[PDB]
C-alpha cells in the first residue's frame, strides 16, 4: 500500500528516471485485465522514447481476445507487446526475446560502429500491485537489507543469455483522475483505497458483468433476475440466495458487496478484460495528440 502526496508523486518521478538512465529497454508491466487503465499517467514522458516492452501480466485471469486488441495498439505506437503469467510461471521466455527485439536497432548501429556486444540492460516500471516483484522474483528464480537500519542495494539480475535485469521497479501511480478508471482499477485491486464509493465499484463490475457476460454471471451465483429490473435486484438476489442477511430478512448490502468485490477481483466468476478497446475510442483520442 503506497500513499502518494505531491511531493511522493515528484520523488518517484525524478527515481524512475534516474533508474531509466541505466538500462537500454524498459518493461512497461500493465494489468492484462485492464491494459490501458493500469498504465502511469505520465509514462511516455518518463520513459521518454526508450525502447518499450509492454508486459501483460495476469494474462491468466484476463480475454485473451480484449488483450490482443491492446496488444495491437501497443504495436501500433512502436512497443513490443508480449503476455505473461508471472505468478505460475508462464510465457516468461517472451521478455527477453521481446527486449532483444526492441533493442536491436540501437545494438545493430552499435556493431557497425564496431563496439563489442554485451548484454542488454533492462528494468520494470508500472503501478503499484500489477506483479512487478512477482515478476522479478520469478525471473531471477529466487527472492528478491536484512539486519534492521541496513538498505540494500540496487543490483543487476541476470536473466536468460542476453539480459541484465535491474532488482528493483520503478514505482508510478496509477491514474487517478477518472472515475471509471477508478473503478477499473478498483475492480482490479490495484487500489484497495478509499473515496471511491465500494458500492458503486460493484455496481459496476455487475453492470459489465450483465453487459458481456450474463449467462456466466448468473451460473455462478445461480440466480435468475428479470432484465427489467434495476440493478438492485440482482443484489437482492445473491444476498438472498447466498443468505446475506440481517435485521430479520433484510439483505446484508454491506456483506454483498464485499462478496461481489472480491469474486471480480480474484477472477472467480470468470476472466475478464474490463478495458473494452471499442468503447474506449474517445478517450484513447484525448490521450493521443500530447
Ligand atoms: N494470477 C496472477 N497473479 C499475479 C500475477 N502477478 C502478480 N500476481 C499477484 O498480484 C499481487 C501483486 O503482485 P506484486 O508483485 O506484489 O505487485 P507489485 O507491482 O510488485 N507492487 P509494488 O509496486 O509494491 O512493487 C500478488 O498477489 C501477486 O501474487 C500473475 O501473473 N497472475
Redesign the pocket.
Known sequence: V?QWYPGHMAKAKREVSEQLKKVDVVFE?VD?RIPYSSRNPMIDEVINQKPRVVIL?????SNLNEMSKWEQFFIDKGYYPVS?????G?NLKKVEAAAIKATAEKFEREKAKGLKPRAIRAMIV????????????KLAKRSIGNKPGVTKQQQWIKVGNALQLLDT?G?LWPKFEDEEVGKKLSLT?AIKDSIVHLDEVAIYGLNFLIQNDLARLKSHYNIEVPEDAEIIAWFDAIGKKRGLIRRGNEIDYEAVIELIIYDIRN?KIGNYCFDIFKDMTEELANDANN
Open positions: 503506497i508491466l492484462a501480466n495476469k494474462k491468466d485471469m505473461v503469467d508471472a505468478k505460475h508462464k508500472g503501478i503499484p500491485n500489477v506483479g512487478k516483484s512477482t515478476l522479478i522474483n521497479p514505482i485491486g477472477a
